[PDB]
Structure 1
Amino acid sequence: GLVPRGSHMKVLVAEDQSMLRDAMCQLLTLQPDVESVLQAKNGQEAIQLLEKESVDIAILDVEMPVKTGLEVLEWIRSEKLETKVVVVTTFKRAGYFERAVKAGVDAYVLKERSIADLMQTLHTVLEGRKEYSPELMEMVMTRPNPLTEQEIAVLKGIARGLSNQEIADQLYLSNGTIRNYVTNILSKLDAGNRTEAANIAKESGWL
């Protein structure tokens, strides 16, 4: 995915806080590696701009009037533009990050970063790489135990080679109830069979 324009990159900055937008764009414009900087105060303006000219990188705030940066991202991808996308946001919201990634954002970074981190992100994405806020990564790779107390009992049962019927007797439940729980457990753990689910749940520290 390397785009060989890193010595003269055309970028767009969409950001609704005027003072920040102004200061970002002035400093980007000053960089030897930046050729030009388009400026947008909200998502609708970003999209109108992108309808009328090409940029190498769209740098996008999330919370903006009219259209958010996530909506602009989703629009750039539906248009198959030859444009990298970097989301730059205050919000450490796991859901925003997930949405961005599903629409193939190239970077997602927090306004806890500096302008130097930002320049580094720009080069990273323009050389075809990805950069994800470590802090958001961490947030999302940490999951609660998804298993109910029953399902945990079932899985312990499974871990001893017990049949569904044997587990039903132990837990004082019907065989059909155990079968449900098993089916349910394969879904929550994306395991293929009952023995797979058991080691995934053990390996993940959930028993």
Structure 2
Amino acid sequence: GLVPRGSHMKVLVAEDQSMLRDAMCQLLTLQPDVESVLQAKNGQEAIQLLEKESVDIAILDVEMPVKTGLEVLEWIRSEKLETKVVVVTTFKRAGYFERAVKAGVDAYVLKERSIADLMQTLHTVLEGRKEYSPELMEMVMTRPNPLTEQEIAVLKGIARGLSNQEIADQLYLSNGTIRNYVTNILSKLDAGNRTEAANIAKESGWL
């Protein structure tokens, strides 16, 4: 992923707040490692600019008129451009972050960061590495217990070596009902058989 243009990078900035866009572009332009900065007020402008010339890094706000930076990210990847993408946003919504990562964003950082932080991010992605907001990583790495009350009881039974039929009896349900829960439980815990499911939910502290 390393693009050996760290001393003369061509970037684009899409950001709909005009005072921030202007200030970002002025300071990037002054950096010795930056060759040029293309500026876009919204995601449709970004895309139009990227249709007509190459950039090494696109720096994208999420919330913008017409097309969001997430939509631009997806366009950039669908076009197979040789362009790193750095999302810079105010928003800590987990869904935006997950969407960016599913589109292979190179970095996702918050407007809590400084310009110096941003310059580091741009060198990191151009050298083929990723940078993900620590706060957003944390947020997303902590999951609820995904299991219903019944499913937990089943798993515990499973742990003790019980058959579905034995568990059925214990919970005063039909064998068919227990088999349904197990199916459900395999899918939720991304486990394969019934004993993987059991160590998965215990090791993740869910019983």
TM-score (structure 1 length as normaliser): 1.00
Residue of structure 2 in register with 1:26 after alignment: 26
For residues 152-186 of structure 1, what are the alpha-carbon distances to aligned partners after superposition, in whole Å with 9 as ceiling and x for unaligned? 00000000000000000000000000000000000
Structure 1 residue 134: Cα displacement = 0.6
Q: 1:41 Cα shift?
A: 0.2
The structural deviation recorded for 1:204 is 0.3
**Cα shift readout 1:61-109 (whole Å, capped 9, x = no counterpart):** 0000000000000000000000000000000000000100001000000
Counterpart secondary structure, 2:59: strand
Q: Distance in 2 between matches of 1:77 and 1:193?
A: 37
Q: Please list, as runs of the form range in 1=range in 2, the aligned pairs for 1:1-207 lying within 5 A after superposition.
A: 1-207=1-207
The 2-side partners of 1:5 and 1:75 are apart by: 23
How far has the Cα of 1:2 moved from its partner? 0.2
CA distance in structure 1 between the aligned counterparts of 2:34 and 2:78, rounded to whole angstroms: 26
Unaligned residue ranges in structure 2 (runs of 5+): none
Q: How many angstroms apart in 1 are the aligned matches of 2:162 and 2:103?
A: 44
Q: Structure 1: how far apart are the matches of 2:151 and 2:96?
A: 31
| Cα distance in 1 between the residues matched to 2:93 and 2:27 | 28
The CA RMSD over aligned residues, in Å, is 0.3
Q: Structure 1 residue runs of 4+, over 6 Å off?
A: none
Measured in 1, the distance between the counterparts of 2:130 and 2:114 equals 18
* Identical pairs, percent: 100
TM-score normalised by L of structure 2:
1.00
